[model samples]
Target chain A: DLKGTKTAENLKQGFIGESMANRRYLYFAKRADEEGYPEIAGLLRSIAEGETAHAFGHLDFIRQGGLTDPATDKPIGTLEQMIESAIAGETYEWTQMYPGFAKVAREEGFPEVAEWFETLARAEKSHAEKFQNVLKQLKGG
Target chain B: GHMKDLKGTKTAENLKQGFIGESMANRRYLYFAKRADEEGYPEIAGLLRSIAEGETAHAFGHLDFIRQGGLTDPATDKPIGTLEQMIESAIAGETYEWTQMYPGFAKVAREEGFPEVAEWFETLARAEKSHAEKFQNVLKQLK
Candidate 1:
């Protein structure tokens, strides 16, 4: 019962982070469009929608009350902090999180979740690249 | 003689111009790829690179046809053509790809729930539409 509570709490926190990222992307996309960078703006807008989907995924996990690690739980950071965090988060997820999760899921007999998370992790890597591009463009580099 | 000259306007000039226009598109794609890479948009950069390569291949095909004497050159050792014809062709190519090729790919990606891939293609399709319009405007200037 205690384990289930921790998982729910983690998921709640995950949704919070996801929500924050979604809002940031949407705001950035609007700024991009307003500045005459419509192609980049469109990409950001689509990614914002993707973040909303991720938030909903965590919401479902919270509703199910699955067991999760409390150590991994944390509050979402500020927008600038989130950008740096996302860079690290994407790299770590691609290198570590997805692989570890998949291994454990396979061992624990939850191949479906493992596969889904792995796919998401790969996409996160792509998102990191997208963010990096926007940052570079903004800096005029 | 002026009336005779008007009646004798050559069609081969259009073919040579078309080949040059195709070559120019290859150059544009290459330029776009550089910007995308510099901006840290690797995925977009990669896509542009692939498209640029494709355009280069296409331009080569036209060059080969021109060299094989498939299209006659009106002037001495010069393929007589106009930039306007090539721009019109480019506009047509973009329109066809946007309306047919990209939409099909996007539909499949969406059905598979590959939102990332779908979104990429969706953005490309929109860009191509803009390119088509730009080409059309350029073509109008030729008239």
Candidate 2:
């Protein structure tokens, strides 16, 4: 229920970070298996599963704050709307979320971190454009 | 450099990269499917889920290619390491997450006035510690 607040932003970032960690952990599992350590790979996957749970918990909080259509005050009901939600999410990341986080990092005296965030924001912008392209093709526009 | 002829070449690195990318996309789409399910779009959720499996299949194929060539260090083309060495790395990763990473994230969340988010980080910190202990115990037995 912390919509439109810094807390919401924190949760969002937390989810994203945990998701990345989960991916890394899974990749680590692959490395372990390649190294002839199947048990170690299993352990890595267990922890990765836990990280996924953590990510989902963060997302659940965000969803409770209304992952809905503002126009209808209802959840997205169609595939097209789902795509719109995806586009909106990526758009927010690039346009407002990451850039705002970068501004804060710079203000807090972390120039390198700021630049890193800027780079992430650019990648997110590309993601947004890609999703937009998908939508366009879906619509034959 | 067709993908078919990429075995044992530097292009195997790209295949490894693609595997990771595809696997991550699988997870990401699963998250979206979770959202869709909660949002009362069962069909959309199904759609997301069906494709999620597809992504994993793609990841599996990519990995199969990499495995056919034998996995090596991405940087040096050497063997990854022994089970003991890998466990050591895993323990270090868990320790860093539990002791340093999540603690720092929790503090930032608290300072930012999100006590709930802070608590979430705290919980994950504890979970990570348990993971470290589990890995340590296994490593102890392996030695």
Candidate 3:
């Protein structure tokens, strides 16, 4: 029922659009500086920051819609379970998501973008590892 | 001239730390928001979500300032290099995270009875392994 709300739909769309704009503008800022236009770079960065702020604003509204756990059809419960869920989430990001993203970036001739994906993948992996360790310790290890 | 020369400056370090901290806080808050929603408190969830975005905006600002002249590598204390070097550098960092840093931190967290935090360290280590392997594949293609 929550998903049926136009408010939620609009918030989701706005969040996605603004987030993409933020990235685009930041990249544009980089290119502007590369082309020896400091003022243009600064302006682009300023706008990019604004875009991020707007994106987050929409995301906040979207979060009010209540999230469901795809695996169980309910909200995740328990701090221990929450951490476990996080591990799974990070695992998916590193294994299934970011690798594919990096591959596409490479195919598109964006080595830097590929590197960025790879770094995120690594960071996610680290997060998963850290969570697993704590889970184990929680279980009396 | 593409990189800033703010090495060893406290303000520069503060910005970097602030960016990372705020980024983590944003994610943490989102997770908390979801938990709140699940517990039948959508209003509280909304409040947390709002604050989460504020943290994200702060993070974005910090990162924007940091990237003004491109990013600096803390390990090398130099500007990040070409694609090949970056791929190689990523491999090194991922390896360190999984093999040493995460393991060490996890042990400490366990010893300190902070299993919740320790779990994060463990998950992060496992994720880093895959990243290292992926980067190594990219490195292989480079040569």
Candidate 4:
């Protein structure tokens, strides 16, 4: 039923097109860097991020979680439960993953990469804090 | 300059996470596939492989939108590979994802009653298994 639906088909094609373009441009970005056109690389990468967003959108649109038994799934949690899961995931990244990733970038001599990861780690911490606040409110003080 | 120094603005930050996470998920699923193959679950493995393909789409999508100036880790591509070594490394990455990463995540997803998410994680674990095996197969010739 999903595969036959027009919307699903569109999403499928959109996902594929967006992904291909995403990779195509990143490679283009790599080329730009190689050719002494850092500015152009900058240009390509930003667009590449946008493409990534578009691709995620299509996947979300599909809304089928389990690929094998994709039987029209939806989130089964309340608003509070959803928020908790979000908090946990963000916490995992900021505390566990990014710290190490940033450290690796530092050791590898990419100052910029380390900075970028640190910024994201900060952003994720902020996100988790916000979610915790929301959970507090929803739980009635 | 190209977008000021800390070009790692919010937009760029979000995209970077997007690009990196999607790519990791894509790789993770194929690793899941290999286990499914070994465990006598072909159909499940097939689904995970297909979903991994979709994840790849998302990864490229994120990369496509990212701005270059700052968040862009420019091409210092002296990566850990010579086609052979790279394949070997990829197998190792998948092995970890299925054996360690997705399995732990799946245990939690089920406990939380996130059936959809739980299935997704388990399927991805099986998918990663197949991926590791397939790559090892390829490495045979490259070696």
TM-score of chain A of 1: 0.43
The per-model lDDT (C-alpha) reads 0.45, 0.62, 0.53, 0.52
Q: Model 4 over residues B1-143: C-alpha lDDT tens digits?
A: 22333343444455455565555444334444554577575664675577566556555544433433334421111122133433454456557666876677567656655556456557657865775676576557446
Q: Which digits, one per residue and each the tens of the lDDT, describe model 4 over residues A1-141?
A: 334443344344445434544454455556557657565566457655655665554454354431211111223123344445446655776797677767765664546656766776786677567657756765773
Stretches of model 2 off by over 4 angstroms after superposition: A1-13, A24-42, A62-82, A85-141, B1-24, B38-42, B57-86
**Per-candidate TM-score against the hidden true structure:** 0.29, 0.55, 0.41, 0.34
lDDT of predicted model 4: 0.52
Please give the ranking of all candidate structures by DockQ, highest first, separated by commas: 2, 4, 3, 1
Give the least accurate 10-residue stretch of model 4 chain B, judged by summed lDDT.
B73-82
Computed on C-alpha atoms, the DockQ of candidate 1 is: 0.01
Cα lDDT tens digits, model 2, A1-141, are 465666666565556556545655566577677768788788779888887898777666666655453212234444455567666755765787667766765665545545755775786576667557656755673
As a whole number from 0 to 100, the lDDT of residue B112 in candidate 4 is 52
Give candidate 3 misplaced runs (Cα > 4 Å): A1-141, B1-4, B70-89, B106-124, B139-143
Docking class of 2: incorrect
**Which candidate comes out best when scored by TM-score?**
2
Model 3 global lDDT (CA atoms, 0 to 1): 0.53
lDDT of 2 at A89: 59
Q: What is the TM-score of chain A in candidate 3?
A: 0.60
Model 4 interface CAPRI class: incorrect
